[PDB]
Amino acid sequence: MLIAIEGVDGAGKRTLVEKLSGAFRAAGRSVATLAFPRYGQSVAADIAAEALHGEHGDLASSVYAMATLFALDRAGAVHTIQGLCRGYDVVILDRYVASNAAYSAARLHENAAGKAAAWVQRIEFARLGLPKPDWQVLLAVSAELAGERSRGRAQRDPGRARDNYERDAELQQRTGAVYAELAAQGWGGRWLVVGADVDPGRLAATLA
Amino acid sequence: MLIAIEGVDGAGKRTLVEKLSGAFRAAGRSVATLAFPRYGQSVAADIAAEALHGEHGDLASSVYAMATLFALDRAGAVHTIQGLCRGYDVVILDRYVASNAAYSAARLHENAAGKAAAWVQRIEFARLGLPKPDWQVLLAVSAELAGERSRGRAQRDPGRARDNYERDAELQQRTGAVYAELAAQGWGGRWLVVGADVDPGRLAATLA
Ligand SMILES: Cc1cn([C@H]2C[C@H](O)[C@@H](COP(=O)(O)O)O2)c(=O)[nH]c1=O
Ligand SMILES: Cc1cn([C@H]2C[C@H](O)[C@@H](COP(=O)(O)O)O2)c(=O)[nH]c1=O
Ligand SMILES: [Mg+2]
Ligand SMILES: [Mg+2]
Numbered sequence: 100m101l102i103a104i105e106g107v108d109g110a111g112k113r114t115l116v117e118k119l120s121g122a123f124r125a126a127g128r129s130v131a132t133l134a135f136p137r138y139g140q141s142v143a144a145d146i147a148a149e150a151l152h153g154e155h156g157d158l159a160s161s162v163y164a165m166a167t168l169f170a171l172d173r174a175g176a177v178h179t180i181q182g183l184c185r186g187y188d189v190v191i192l193d194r195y196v197a198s199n200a201a202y203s204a205a206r207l208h209e210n211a212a213g214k215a216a217a218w219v220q221r222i223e224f225a226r227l228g229l230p231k232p233d234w235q236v237l238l239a240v241s242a243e244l245a246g247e248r249s250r251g252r253a254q255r256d257p258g259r260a261r262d263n264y265e266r267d268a269e270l271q272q273r274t275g276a277v278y279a280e281l282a283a284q285g286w287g288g289r290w291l292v293v294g295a296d297v298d299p300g301r302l303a304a305t306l307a
Numbered sequence: 308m309l310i311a312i313e314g315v316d317g318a319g320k321r322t323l324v325e326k327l328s329g330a331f332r333a334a335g336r337s338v339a340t341l342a343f344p345r346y347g348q349s350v351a352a353d354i355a356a357e358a359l360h361g362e363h364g365d366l367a368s369s370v371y372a373m374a375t376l377f378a379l380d381r382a383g384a385v386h387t388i389q390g391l392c393r394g395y396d397v398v399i400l401d402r403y404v405a406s407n408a409a410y411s412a413a414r415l416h417e418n419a420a421g422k423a424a425a426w427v428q429r430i431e432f433a434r435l436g437l438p439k440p441d442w443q444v445l446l447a448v449s450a451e452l453a454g455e456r457s458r459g460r461a462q463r464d465p466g467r468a469r470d471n472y473e474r475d476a477e478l479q480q481r482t483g484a485v486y487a488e489l490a491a492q493g494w495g496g497r498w499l500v501v502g503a504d505v506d507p508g509r510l511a512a513t514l515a
Pocket of ligand 1: 199
């Protein structure tokens with residue numbers, strides 16, 4: 100079973116992955132996790148991150164260039180994902196293809212039924228062959244609270260300063276809205292919308 | 308020995324590679340060739356090409372995004388290049404790293420000592436580990452004649468319509484000028500500047 104955890108920056112995805120993995124293991128299932136972007140393991144992922152921190156000329160100014168880099172990062176992980184799915188009972192991803200649809204549409208002020216989301220579908224699932232997730236869990240949180248978490252992280256960790264997307268409050272708001280639409284539309288597969296107070300044990304039961 | 312053939316679009320590079328390969332083989336040396344972008348064998352190369360033909364939103368509008376895609380294409384060929392160099396006496400490339408420096412600098416109206424060329428050096432040779440060529444042969448041709456060849460190709464081949472770069476006469480002119488500077492500076496290694504009437508036999512002897 101392939102599960103992807105989605106949501107805006109600072110929504111609490113990393114923590115939910117930890118809790119969810121614990122719940123599944125407590126139920127006797129083997130779990131493997133992977134986070135995108137694969138910082139350090141992908142040139143594409145690293146250049147993308149660096150561009151969001153002000154490097155690489157005009158790269159970050161292109162919405163499709165950024166989307167392509169994140170897609171190329173995942174392209175390099177296709178075999179790894181397939182291998183994990185046949186080796187473990189559950190594979191949980193901290194961000195996946197939907198992140199590209201949500202952020203790209205939001206940067207272009209488009210909705211889930213727009214051009215960018217359709218492009219992501221065509222490129223990542225059909226062309227690159229990335230498997231569609233069995234479940235996509237949207238950790239919905241107020242744009243205000245998520246932004247507060249991102250700012251707090253930068254304050255206590257010099258290695259986690261905010262990037263261009265995180266500094267854009269309006270973009271984060273629009274991204275959250277597109278995510279809600281993607282979930283309602285069942286984009287890329289079935290979705291579940293949860294809040295910060297979701298119970299890991301029952302969520303795992305729902306996904307199982 | 309690693310040799311890269313450089314020059315603007317329609318300069319006659321593909322033909323020179325054929326003639327040069329023949330000369331080396333006539334001298335008893337084993338030869339292997341590779342052309343960049345690796346159309347069909349690289350997602351990065353294909354998306355780059357498609358962007359130059361009007362697809363993928365705002366991707367082509369970013370100079371660094373295009374450069375990154377061509378660099379990622381080469382990154383996926385590092386092992387292939389190293390393998391060919393230890394398996395054959397001579398390895399000839401139809402375009403290599405210098406193409407990225409020349410075209411990127413030209414799109415930004417910069418010279419060979421500018422920011423873009425320096426970025427290509429840092430990213431491709433140092434960071435990606437691409438081997439520096441023993442020789443880089445600049446097939447210098449009048450911008451007018453090269454443009455005529457590109458237009459003629461599109462006229463007789465529906466599968467070879469010109470792309471955004473080829474349709475930009477001024478860009479082609481500036482690229483030729485940056486190439487001349489790169490050669491004079493010995494950027495990335497030693498260069499040889501030749502014309503359309505260069506003798507394949509003697510050129511091969513010079514490179515040998
Ligand atoms: C994985 C992924 C992330 N992003 C984003 C959202 C984040 O603001 C930024 C880096 O992700 P991160 O916050 O998970 O480290 O890039 C995309 O736009 N597309 C993608 O496919
Ligand atoms: C290989 C390569 C090509 N290019 C260009 C020059 C050509 O106009 C275009 C496609 O190359 P081609 O003419 O050899 O098919 O992309 C770069 O800008 N950087 C590179 O690294
Ligand atoms: Mg982030
Ligand atoms: Mg061309």
